[PDB]
């Protein structure tokens, strides 16, 4: 009855508002906040943008579809809004897999990463993934490579009220397989070396730390001075080889200065036959140790939480329209044992996590004050 209509109406015009917010609120806070203007902030402005035309230019149109029973702005436009549709999940998707590999960067080559990876080689690449999602949505469907042979269809492509997406056996293939599931298998492949590699640099400075913690306790359990020499000269290799060991490195390394200083000046007491007051100048070690173990704790768990809500938005956005496109692939290879309803539920929650980007976002400490102090 009408009460449904109502009600369905009013939740997906909350669908609406809700998209359009936070979309608008992260293109703003990258736009102005000064600190927001990374190269992987650069794809997340990809993203919010494909979401946020998403949203505007389908959401509205899709209720209208199925609230209407019926389209009503001509078959071309339908053509267009179908377009659209295609061309930004394709985006989305495609600009999670850029991501994934931005990602793949600064973790495995930062060398190469803040060396030829600009804020116009940003815009290049963005503009490309848009290009190349734009052709393989706008072209198979404006040029008409889509149509059904089924005749009801070709009685919708001339209807000028109907627009139901009825596609042949190529474009269902060609069009979920390409545009869904290759940027889904190489983001998915990539993101996977991504956490290993980054469970693999969290490691390695470990290993590296272990070694001086360990060195660090044999200090004080010694009776001359020939231990705290061995100890001290390969703990100061550790030091130099965790100095040689990014974006907020600037304070890591500064502190390494600080740090094999007081080897040298704990190394220089051992080199001269004395090592009781060299125990008590290895004790500030602990000082060192404490102070910048904490500053490590806190960026990597930064860095963890980062790569785990990036982790989370692909993950999402895999959990919504994974559905949909499984159901496009088993409801074409057989004669339609999926109703209309089904498809339209599962597309509408892929159409729906479009508003739940931002709000993971926020769960990064910095996009949440940023989008507290916007608001
Ligand atoms: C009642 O009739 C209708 C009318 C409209 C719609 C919405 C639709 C336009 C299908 N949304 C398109 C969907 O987002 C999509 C995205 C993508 O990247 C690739 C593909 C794709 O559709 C299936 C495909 O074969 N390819 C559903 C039913």
Redesign the pocket.
């Known amino acids: 009855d009408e009460v449904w209509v109502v009600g369905m109406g009013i939740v997906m015009s909350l669908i609406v508002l809700a998209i359009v917010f936070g979309n608008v609120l992260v293109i703003t806070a990258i736009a102005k906040f000064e600190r927001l203007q990374t190269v992987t902030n650069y794809f997340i402005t990809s993203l919010a943008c494909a979401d946020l035309v998403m949203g505007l230019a389908v959401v509205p149109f899709?209720a209208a579809?199925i609230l209407m029973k019926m389209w009503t702005f001509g078959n071309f436009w339908c053509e267009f809004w179908?377009s659209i549709?295609?061309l930004c999940?394709?985006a989305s998707i495609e600009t999670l897999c850029v991501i994934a590999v931005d990602r793949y960067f600064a973790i495995t080559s930062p060398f190469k990463y803040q060396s030829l990876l600009t804020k116009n080689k940003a815009r290049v690449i963005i503009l490309m993934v848009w290009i190349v999602s734009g052709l393989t949505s706008f072209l198979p469907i404006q040029m008409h490579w889509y149509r059904a042979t089924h005749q009801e269809a070709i009685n919708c492509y001339a209807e000028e009220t109907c627009?139901?997406?009825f596609?042949n056996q190529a474009?269902?293939i060609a069009?979920?397989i390409v545009?869904?599931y290759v940027p889904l298998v190489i983001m998915v492949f990539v993101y996977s070396r991504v956490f290993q590699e980054a469970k693999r640099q969290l490691a390695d400075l470990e290993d590296n730390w272990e070694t001086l913690n360990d060195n660090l306790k044999v200090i004080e359990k010694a009776d001359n001075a020939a231990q705290v020499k061995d100890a001290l000269t390969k703990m100061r290799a550790a030091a130099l080889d965790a100095q040689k060991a990014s974006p907020e490195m600037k304070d890591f390394r500064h502190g390494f200065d600080i740090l094999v200083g007081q080897i040298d000046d704990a190394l220089k007491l051992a080199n001269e036959g004395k090592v009781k007051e060299a125990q008590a100048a290895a004790e500030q070690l602990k000082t060192t140790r404490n102070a910048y173990i904490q500053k490590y704790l806190k960026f990597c768990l930064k860095e963890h939480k980062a790569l785990k809500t990036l982790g989370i938005i692909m993950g999402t956005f895999t959990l919504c329209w994974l559905p949909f496109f499984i159901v496009?692939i088993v409801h074409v290879i057989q004669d339609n044992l999926i109703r209309?309803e089904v498809?339209?539920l599962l597309?509408w929650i892929?159409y729906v996590n479009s508003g739940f980007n931002p709000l993971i976002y926020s769960r990064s400490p910095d996009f949440r004050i940023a989008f507290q102090e916007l608001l």
């Open positions: 899709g579809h179908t549709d295609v999940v394709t627009c139901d997406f596609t474009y269902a069009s979920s545009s869904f496009n209309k498809y339209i597309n892929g």
